[PDB]
Paper text:
MARV VP35 RBD was crystallized in complex with a 12-bp dsRNA oligonucleotide. Data were complete to 2.5 Å resolution and the structure was determined by molecular replacement in space group P21. Thus, in these crystals, the dsRNA molecules together assemble one, pseudo-continuous dsRNA helix. This arrangement results in a complete coating of the dsRNA by VP35 RBDs, with each of the conserved, central basic patches of VP35 RBD facing the dsRNA sugar-phosphate backbone. Each VP35 RBD–dsRNA interaction involves ∼520 Å2 of buried surface and is accomplished by direct hydrogen bonds between N261, Q263, T267, R271, S299, and I329 and the ribose-phosphate dsRNA backbone.
The structures and accompanying dsRNA-binding analysis performed by dot-blot assays and isothermal titration calorimetry reveal that MARV VP35 RBD coats the sugar-phosphate backbone along the length of dsRNA in addition to capping at the terminus, suggesting an alternate mechanism of dsRNA masking for immunosuppression.
Author numbering:
A (entry chain A), B (entry chain G), C (entry chain E), D (entry chain C): 208 to 329
Write the structure that this text describes.
RNA sequence: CUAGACGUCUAG
RNA sequence: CUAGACGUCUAG
């Protein structure tokens, strides 16, 4: 199952659109796919849901416990400006810390044309 | 007190029409009735109200604490499509998780004519 | 300042006519006057406005914090039927809870000729 | 770019005539110009539009976030009477609060020939 | 203390 | 479309 199809599937479990969790779904999906852990990642995700957790709690937990995400630095996404970042994510932008990693809640790093950077934090 | 009468009574405490809480009222009433807990349920509902809680917070609380609802899987409701579902509920629809239970906020499972399913989440 | 004059003054700060907030202005003015807290009530109301809050936010806040309103049960108002209640208030009518008090958002209790009761809720 | 030209430019983005937002455009422009922020103001206005916001949402937002408007008291406008105020604005008139500021939605203060005052609220 | 997703109403 | 009041769920 491709990263795209994987991300879309996780989307069906999330409320709203273009939320920090949506971005996290895309990021975790891609990292999982490229690691060949696409199937295992999906299984773990559903396992958590069965425990009584919701999609959001599952993604945050997986980002902290799924070995494939441990120590992995958030991906850098280029954007005209920070106002280009999905609206529901804007208020979650922080200055980038020295060593950003996904297991620490850092979803991605936005880079503006002006060279400025902001990290999406959950 | 029948399920219908019980639901209609809860409706008088709820704002608007056909809200997720309206659906929850019906589900909870129906389950309570066939459990023989129709009376206890209503009493508990009034007790919570007397504590200062509103109707909405009372229903969600009951769904989480009332023993007759614990572990109970949400009922399946047939609909032509997901646009047939009451307006006020549509944006609260999500993919059905592995083990949906009412005590976890899952009101009901809608099934469409093409075998698709969406779960009402509060 | 009389309850009437007091209510009329608050009216000038409220948008529209015969809204739930208009009814609240009357109820709070009446209770305040009878308590001899007419002056204090008006002062607190303006103190809040100066904070940047609007009239509506001020009234709901006072109803929750102004000691003179704490634990006070909403006044019962007689009306032919619930259709007699001001239009703008009709959709805010709920069944009366066990222990209605103003500090809980309950403005007043409407009693119809048929003995039915509805509570105005903000 | 003078205050007049600036206001006329904002007008081209606004629906109808003599609406509360038209008055806001004039006030905000006049204040911006005198602050030497005429240019910055226009740029910010266009920036917001490019984000998907309409002219109306842009003005209200600027009035809340543009530093040149923070803490500024609405200007006083003389009128024969409150029926002389643009029709589209009349129903938005309210009693002047203790400390009216533009960043709180207060556009302007109208004063009549009888020494009476009303504030335009958005 | 942040933030996200809903629901109800009111005024223009 | 804009402004406001009330409430429900959730994540850090």
């Amino acid at each position: 199952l491709s990263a795209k199809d994987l991300a879309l599937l996780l989307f069906t479990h999330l409320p709203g659109n273009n939320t920090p969790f949506h971005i996290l779904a895309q990021v975790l999906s891609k990292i999982a796919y490229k690691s060949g852990k696409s199937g295992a990642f999906l299984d773990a995700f559903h396992q958590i849901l069965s425990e009584g957790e919701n999609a959001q709690a599952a993604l945050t937990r997986l980002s902290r416990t799924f070995d494939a995400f441990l120590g992995v630095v958030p991906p850098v996404i280029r954007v005209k400006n920070f106002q280009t970042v999905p609206r529901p994510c804007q208020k979650s932008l922080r200055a980038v810390p020295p060593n950003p990693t996904i297991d620490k809640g850092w979803v991605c790093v936005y880079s503006s044309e002006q060279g400025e950077t902001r990290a999406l934090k959950i």
